[PDB]
Design a protein around this ligand. Structure first.
Ligand SMILES: [Cl-]
Ligand SMILES: [Cl-]
Length: 162
C-alpha cells in the first residue's frame, strides 16, 4: 500500500465531470475543478488542466496524470508550510501518507487549522489525536473516509485499507 493506492481507494476514479461530496465539480481521482456552480466554468477549467478540448470527458492516462500532479503538489504544499512541515518530518512513513491524504482532501490551509491534533501527532499521542481529529466537520461529513485516515494515524499500519 502507498499514498497513490490509498487515495485511489478513498477518491475513486470517474472519467466524466461529477459533483463531489460537497457539490463541487470534480473529475478523475478527486481533482477538484472549480467551486463555481457553473458547469461551463468546470469544462473550461478542465480544457485548461488537460490542454485540449475535452467536452467533459478524459481518458484514464489523463486522469492519472492529474493525480500524479496533485499528489506531488500536496507533498510540496506540506513541505513549504511552516505549521505542517515540522509535523510531517516527525512522522513515520505510513502516518506521513495519512497527512498527505488530509491535505489532498482539504488543502493545506484546512489541515493547518487542526492545531490541537497537529500538536498531539507531533508528540506521538496517537489515541488522543484520533479522538481530537474526530471532533470536526470533516469527520461528520465524510465519516467512513475520515475513520480510515484516523485509524492510520492511530495505528501506523495500512489495516483500515486492507
Ligand atoms: Cl491543473
Ligand atoms: Cl466517507
Amino acid at each position: 500500500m502507498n499514498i497513490f493506492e490509498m487515495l485511489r481507494i478513498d477518491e475513486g476514479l470517474r472519467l466524466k465531470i461529477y459533483k463531489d461530496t460537497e457539490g463541487y465539480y470534480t473529475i478523475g481521482i478527486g481533482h477538484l475543478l472549480t467551486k463555481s456552480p457553473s458547469l461551463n466554468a468546470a469544462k473550461s477549467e478542465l480544457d485548461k488542466a488537460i490542454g485540449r478540448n475535452t467536452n467533459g470527458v478524459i481518458t484514464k492516462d489523463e486522469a492519472e496524470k492529474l493525480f500524479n500532479q496533485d499528489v506531488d503538489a500536496a507533498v510540496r504544499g506540506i513541505l513549504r508550510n511552516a505549521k505542517l512541515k515540522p509535523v510531517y518530518d516527525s512522522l513515520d512513513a505510513v502516518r506521513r501518507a495519512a497527512a498527505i491524504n488530509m491535505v489532498f482532501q482539504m488543502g493545506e490551509t484546512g489541515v493547518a487549522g487542526f492545531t490541537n491534533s497537529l500538536r498531539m501527532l507531533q508528540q506521538k499521542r496517537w489515541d488522543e489525536a484520533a479522538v481530537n481529529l474526530a471532533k470536526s466537520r470533516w469527520y461528520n461529513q465524510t465519516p467512513n473516509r475520515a475513520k480510515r485516515v484516523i485509524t492510520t494515524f492511530r495505528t501506523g499500519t495500512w489495516d483500515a485499507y486492507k
